[PDB]
Design a protein around this ligand. Structure first.
Ligand code: K
Ligand code: K
Ligand code: K
Ligand code: MG
Ligand code: MG
Ligand code: MG
Ligand code: MG
Ligand code: MG
Ligand code: MG
Ligand code: MG
Ligand code: MG
Ligand code: MG
Ligand code: ZN
Lengths: 51, 63, 132, 225, 343
RNA sequence: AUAUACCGCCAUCUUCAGCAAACCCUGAUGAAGGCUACAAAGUAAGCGCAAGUACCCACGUAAAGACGUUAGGUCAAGGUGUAGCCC
């Protein structure tokens, strides 16, 4: 998936520029996993880091 | 790259629009003249239909 | 339909030479002969031997100058002299053309026991008569 | 630096005047009436899209409203003059063989182009193949007759719109003006009507070409000094 | 026999069998055809099995200012040359075997959705680099002829667009597929429509039209909604530049009728400025995100009417039962509102 | 062995005149279709016919005769793909 294919992308609550890519800029909702194709493991880590 | 869809709008609208979209790099020589002194009716294709039922032409006899 | 020595019409992308573009019925009308000797004249002998030599020289030169021949050979015999006239390309270095001329003239002179000379005309590209 | 002033004093200045070439002095409703421009075809031949331009029917013969013709003719002549001023290619088209010779001479005399012959498929839409990749097409097509000899619209009307070329056209009561840019309701059959049209366009075109030279010449003389 | 030998062209023309009754009407179910390999490609004039070094042919003529003499490579030195030639030959074959991975379209074997690149530059130095081309349908059509019987042709539908409102489509016909691609895409740029976009992301209003038997219902959507439309509509919308729209296709699902209907609907939409000019009133936009703030989107250029638009207590507008059934929670579908990839 | 993998050389319609690249247009941009000379959408390179050449003429006879049709004929002219035989 997009996160797992690049080991330098780190899902962390401080890397806000990466987290913004998984939130809708117009609605602020977090994309569901099929939207971006991230695995369930990384989508949970993204949702926790975003929060 | 002028559009050849002569039944979609008029030569002015099709030319005006493609100029805005950047498809036409330069305006044609006639565009500024048409804009300044346009026709009474914009030349848009219309399909002529036969009249039916109680429809009559509005032309009156001259007496 | 006749097939013999006929380059068939295509899509207009196939370049043919003047020799290739003419069917056999144009021989002696629009195109000449690629070998000239006396063996096929009335009252002349050794036509069989001149024919075998011609077939060999064409094969020999095709493989001796691989990829260099731009048209068919013209074979000329006068007395015991044998002259081979070939139209070649301008890709090989001139040193290689001089090597092969010296080599071929000598080898063919000892093979056919006659003075053999090779005359090369170079062209930048295959001369195209038409696109069939 | 000098191009903007050129295009502004020469190309943009005429477009700021309602009648820069004074083409209204060329005709009047009376001059049109004497040329029989008001005479249309019989009512049975009437095209539906010409009803707005028809004054009425006089004993089953349609009469064209010359008050509208006068306004439409002003626009068409004004447009034609401006295009001649800008050095546009003007092509006259008509298949009416009674006037082929007259129209061809008028075109040559004004320095423009005429096509009065059988119109071969693709003269406009396939011009690059027929003439060459660098062929310049007309900037304005003037139809003195918009119908072909089987009483259908001349193919060049549709193809002119396809090529985005403005069209001026005399449209009789049996014609279709939908795709004609500047239609002029008028009689296209009577020799007096057709002769008048040729004089007006010839005069409008010739005047605009002379006006272009006067302006340019003045702009150059003043430029040196 | 030396005299029974033929040239490479003669040998390959026979072995390949490109011309024959089998090629005529695809009479055989064949897949992997023999491919001619140029056997003179890596060959050097003068190089032979014996390893002789001919001065002036395969080695330099002069060495150290003196003419070289005839020499022969050693057995070991010749083994290296032969092995090096085989490795180079295998490398040449290896690279030819290696092939690039095509990005797929709507499905792995389908042509639909695949980009064909920009249309070719016109004869008069005209260019369309700003335009992208997409395939919508590739169909093998067949006609029956007196002599040849069943003859095969290709019909291609392609769409072109620059992503900024200018888009068009054209059919291409040819015996070969690559020629059909060329004709369609090059023709399409001469039949471009201009499509008006609201805020350069959606349509100005809901569009519901029928073209022949194909029904298309399109809904204006806010930013972030994405393209939730028939896959072909998605492809065309990216060429036009529409980012957010819902569309539902009903009736006959024909690609050419869908494309022609789509472009008709999108070309015939009334903008807000046109609506204001037609009615001489302000067009005021109300957004729930912005609360009760009235946002004037368009004002008439001419005079502004003083008489309010009549307020019909009940509009006599025709409603779509599917729209009403959904708003009332009576629409049940396992396939509606499914999670999908970003489009 | 396979002419039902082919080159090569051919029969056949042909005692035919058509084939067709690249464009253009019509059919709502469907498969498809494209002519009227007082002309109404076709332009068509190339190939064939024709023209030329051979024989005693410009006549006649030869030769020529495209694209395709019959998986037509020929693996036994020679060559050759695939498969098979090698005391
Ligand atoms: K055969
Ligand atoms: K054989
Ligand atoms: K065999
Ligand atoms: Mg025969
Ligand atoms: Mg009339
Ligand atoms: Mg099978
Ligand atoms: Mg697959
Ligand atoms: Mg056979
Ligand atoms: Mg015969
Ligand atoms: Mg002949
Ligand atoms: Mg058989
Ligand atoms: Mg039989
Ligand atoms: Zn993952």
């Amino acid at each position: 998936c997009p996160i797992c294919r690049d080991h330098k992308l780190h899902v962390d609550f401080r890397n806000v520029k990466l987290l913004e890519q998984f939130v809708c800029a117009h609605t602020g909702i977090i994309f569901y996993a099929p939207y971006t194709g991230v695995c369930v493991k990384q989508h949970k880590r993204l949702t926790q880091a975003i929060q | 790259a002028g559009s050849r869809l002569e039944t979609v709008g008029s030569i002015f609208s099709r030319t005006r629009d493609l100029v805005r979209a950047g498809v036409l790099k330069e305006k044609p020589l006639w565009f500024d003249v048409y804009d300044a002194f346009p026709p009474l009716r914009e030349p848009v294709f219309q399909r002529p239909r036969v009249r039916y039922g109680k429809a009559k032409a509005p032309i009156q006899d001259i007496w | 339909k006749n097939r013999a020595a006929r380059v068939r019409v295509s899509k207009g992308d196939k370049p043919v030479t003047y020799e290739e573009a003419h069917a056999p019925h144009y021989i002696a009308h629009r195109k000449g002969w690629l070998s000239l000797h006396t063996g096929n004249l009335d009252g002349e002998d050794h036509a069989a031997e001149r024919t075998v030599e011609d077939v060999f020289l064409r094969k020999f030169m095709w493989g001796t100058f691989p990829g260099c021949l731009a048209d068919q050979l013209v074979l000329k015999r006068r007395g015991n002299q044998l002259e081979i006239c070939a139209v070649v390309l301008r890709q090989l270095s001139p040193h290689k053309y001089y090597f092969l001329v010296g080599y071929s003239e000598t080898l063919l002179s000892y093979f056919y026991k006659c003075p053999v000379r090779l005359h090369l005309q170079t062209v930048p590209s295959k001369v195209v008569y038409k696109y069939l | 630096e000098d191009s903007t002033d050129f295009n502004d004093k020469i190309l943009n200045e005429p477009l700021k005047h309602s009648d820069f070439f004074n083409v209204k002095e060329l005709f009047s409703v009376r001059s049109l009436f004497d040329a029989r421009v008001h005479l249309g075809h019989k009512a049975g031949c009437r095209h539906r899209f010409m009803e707005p331009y028809i004054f009425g029917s006089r004993l089953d013969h349609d009469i064209i409203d010359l008050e509208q013709t006068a306004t439409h003719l002003q626009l068409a002549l004004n447009f034609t003059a401006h295009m001649a001023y800008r050095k546009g290619i003007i092509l006259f088209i008509s298949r009416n063989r009674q006037f082929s010779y007259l129209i061809e001479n008028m075109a040559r005399d004004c320095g423009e182009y005429a096509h009065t012959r059988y119109f071969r498929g693709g003269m406009l839409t396939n011009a690059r193949l027929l003439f060459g990749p660098t062929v310049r097409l007309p900037d304005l097509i003037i139809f003195l007759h918009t119908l072909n000899n089987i009483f259908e619209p001349h193919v060049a009307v549709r193809d002119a719109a396809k090529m985005n070329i403005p069209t001026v056209g005399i449209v009789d009561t049996n014609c279709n003006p939908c795709l004609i840019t500047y239609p002029v309701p008028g009689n296209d059959d009577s020799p007096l009507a057709v002769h008048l049209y040729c004089r007006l366009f010839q005069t409008a075109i010739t005047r605009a070409k002379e006006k272009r030279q006067q302006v340019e010449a003045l702009y150059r003389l003043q430029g040196q000094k | 026999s030396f005299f029974t030998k033929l040239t490479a062209d003669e040998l390959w023309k026979g072995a390949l069998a490109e011309t024959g009754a089998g090629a005529k009407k695809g009479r055989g179910k064949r897949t992997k055809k023999k491919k001619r390999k140029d056997l003179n490609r890596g060959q050097i004039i003068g190089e032979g099995r014996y390893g002789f070094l001919w001065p002036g042919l395969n080695v330099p003529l002069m060495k150290n200012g003196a003419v070289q003499t005839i020499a022969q490579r050693s057995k070991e030195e010749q083994e290296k040359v032969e092995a090096d030639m085989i490795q180079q030959r295998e490398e040449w074959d290896r690279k030819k075997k290696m092939k690039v991975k095509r990005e797929r379209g709507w499905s792995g074997n389908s042509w639909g959705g695949i980009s064909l690149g920009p249309p070719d530059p016109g004869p008069c130095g005209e260019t369309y680099e700003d335009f992208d081309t997409r395939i919508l349908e590739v169909r093998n059509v067949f006609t029956m002829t007196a002599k040849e019987g069943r003859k095969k042709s290709i019909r291609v539908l392609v769409a072109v667009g620059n992503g900024k409102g200018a888009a068009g489509f054209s059919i291409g016909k040819a015996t070969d597929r690559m020629d059909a691609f060329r004709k369609a895409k090059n023709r399409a740029v001469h039949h471009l429509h201009y499509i008006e976009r609201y805020e350069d992301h959606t349509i100005f209003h809901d569009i519901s039209l029928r073209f022949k038997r194909t029904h298309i219902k399109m809904k204006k959507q806010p930013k972030g909604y994405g393209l939730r439309c028939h896959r072909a509509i998605i492809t065309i919308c990216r060429l036009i530049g529409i980012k957010d729209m819902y569309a539902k296709v009903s009736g006959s699902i024909n690609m050419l009728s869908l494309t022609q209907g789509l472009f008709r609907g999108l070309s015939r939409q009334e903008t807000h400025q046109q609506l204001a000019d037609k009615k001489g009133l302000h067009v005021v936009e109300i957004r729930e995100e912005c609360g009760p703030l009235p946002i004037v989107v368009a004002s008439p250029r001419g005079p502004l009417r003083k008489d309010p638009e009549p307020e019909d207590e009940v509009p006599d507008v025709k409603l779509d039962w599917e729209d009403v059934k959904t708003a009332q929670g009576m629409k049940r579908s396992v396939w509606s509102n499914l999670k999908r990839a970003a489009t």
